[PDB]
């Protein structure tokens with residue numbers, strides 16, 4: 001039985017509005033409704049992994065697991081295994097996988113983050129799950145961010161708290177937050193960004209939705225505008241939105257958007273918005289293709305409609321050679337040549353690098369670089385040809401060219417990371433000096449750049 005080099009992953013996000021679901025929710029898992037929808041000819045083909053995020057979920061874990069498993073069994077005639085379930089208040093994540101994957105899945109982690117302080121602490125935050133699928137690390141975040149059209153900055157703050165404090169994946173990757181720990185990271189939820197148009201334009205907006213004319217609405221979507229201004233979700237992807245706003249509906253129909261201010265809303269308008277989103281971030285040059293992104297039309301118990309997204313994701317096999325794991329493979333080496341970091345910091349400490357990768361027995365600390373002043377004010381940290389030669393555990397190019405090196409630049413004075421990035425070893429050539437590049441971030445914000453050349457020796 002061969003190990004896969006691709007899997008498909010279903011992501012669902014649904015703010016259930018504190019109401020039980022209807023008896024049939026299969027359209028959700030079949031990616032049927034509005035938007036980029038899945039071909040009918042695929043209906044019986046199970047996804048490999050289903051990750052379900054809910055918000056305002058009124059059910060017990062047991063109640064929801066029974067609905068989800070019986071839903072998938074009806075679609076696929078497969079009895080899915082529960083990988084993980086984690087709930088914070090009424091925010092929940094469920095991961096289900098095909099039984100054939102049970103022995104491929106390991107290192108399962110769960111965590112949650114509560115956002116806000118005092119007043120603003122007590123119902124918003126995030127849950128997440130990570131695990132290994134053979135040689136590939138997968139992370140999943142379901143967040144329910146702060147509500148209200150005039151709170152986009154709070155949402156952006158909630159995002160930074162979640163990526164700083166959610167403790168998933170390999171704890172040995174200590175300089176790295178969740179935005180660097182996984183081959184593939186999926187972040188979804190009721191992100192609660194709104195269409196920023198005047199209240200007076202409500203009926204115009206509804207008109208546009210009925211005509212399926214989303215362009216003039218998407219141009220005011222706060223998540224797209226905040227992302228374009230690099231205020232949030234830096235280096236994440238989202239598929240193009242081609243489905244109607246998923247909030248705020250009158251319950252038991254989808255014919256009516258309920259936007260007017262009410263005591264129940266705190267006297268806030270809820271103009272039609274794309275609150276419910278799926279984004280991802282994968283390591284450079286790893287296959288990831290969105291094959292659906294849309295909303296259901298026939299599940300009407302909530303004031304939100306469910307959102308689905310599906311992905312092809314590249315995965316790698318556990319690799320065993322005669323040599324590694326358990327030793328180095330002397331026919332392998334990674335040389336980082338003529339490298340320099342460009343940092344936005346005003347500090348004047350010396351800096352060193354750390355190289356982290358599951359292709360190394362343990363992380364590697366460099367010597368301190370040489371600081372110079374850039375022409376436009378910047379700090380440039382030069383490493384020259386001084387960087388330690390990295391000794392991978394396995395030299396076989398079928399393994400090594402699929403790996404990645406995480407880089408942290410740390411202060412000698414404080415040992416704190418000033419920037420984190422990632423370099424793919426999927427090179428155009430071996431035994432050849434080739435340009436490399438990564439942006440550097442810290443707490444998910446841009447802090448600089450790392451560039452230089454690499455020379456990779458494999459056994460071929």
Ligand SMILES: CC[C@H](CO)NC(=O)Nc1ccc(Cl)cc1
Pocket residue numbers: 081082083084097098099101102103105106108
């Ligand atoms: C039982 C010991 C560990 C740690 O709790 N759990 C585990 O491996 N769970 C699991 C793996 C694969 C799949 Cl498909 C479903 C569940």
Ligand SMILES: CC[C@H](CO)NC(=O)Nc1ccc(Cl)cc1
Pocket residue numbers: 224225227228
């Ligand atoms: C894929 C990386 C390239 C490099 O420039 N561009 C990019 O990501 N552009 C972009 C991001 C967010 C939004 Cl909202 C609109 C455009």
